[PDB]
Amino acid sequence: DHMELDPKNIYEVEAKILLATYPKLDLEPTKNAEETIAKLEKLAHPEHSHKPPEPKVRDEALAAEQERYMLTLDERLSSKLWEPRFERFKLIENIKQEHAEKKEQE
């Protein structure tokens, strides 16, 4: 078996989950268009009653230029004109723990 769920049983499992989730449905026929309209109005769902979306749409210069000129040839700060994650520190911690644990045996 190995795996927790063989794909070929996915349809049966989903069918049983659906059966458990929706135990009662509305299976009463209507007789004319007005009844269908009323039933559609009555069964409305808040999560499926939104509206259609909206169409998608599209003096200091001297100071800025002076700063840009003054930052000439700056390797790192010039490009910007920053989300630390401490990855090197965590790598160091992991390696230190592994080395200490290995030294425990010896």
Partner: peptide
């Protein structure tokens, strides 16, 4: 067994255990 899988899934999901019409109808019957 599918029953075991379904039960496990459900447990892990926190599932607790007006007059014109009448006139026309009458005329048509008549």
């Amino acid at each position: 067994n599918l029953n075991q899988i379904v039960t496990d899934y459900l447990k892990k999901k926190g599932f607790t255990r007006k007059y014109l019409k009448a006139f026309l109808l009458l005329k048509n019957w008549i």
